[PDB]
């Protein structure tokens, strides 16, 4: 877990730009599969 904290800090998701529900995530995962 030495690099895990640095990995936690590193991720540049601060620009979301998404703009529903986790059920939609499940059905879309099934569609992708």
């Amino acid at each position: 877990l030495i690099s895990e904290i640095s990995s936690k800090s590193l991720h540049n998701l601060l620009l979301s730009e998404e703009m529903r529900s986790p059920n939609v995530r499940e059905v879309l995962y099934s569609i992708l599969f």
């Binding site: 690099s3 990995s7 936690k8 590193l10 991720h11 540049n12 998701l13 998404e18 986790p22």
Partner: peptide, 30 residues
């Protein structure tokens, strides 16, 4: 932490690419 069960497809791609980048940086020094 913001667990991975709420992220996007390209954000999960970012996670796996950072994992493989750390692995490559660890192994390239040989």
């Amino acid at each position: 932490w913001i667990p991975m069960s709420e992220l996007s497809l390209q954000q999960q791609f970012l996670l796996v690419t950072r994992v493989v980048s750390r692995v490559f940086n660890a192994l390239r020094k040989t």
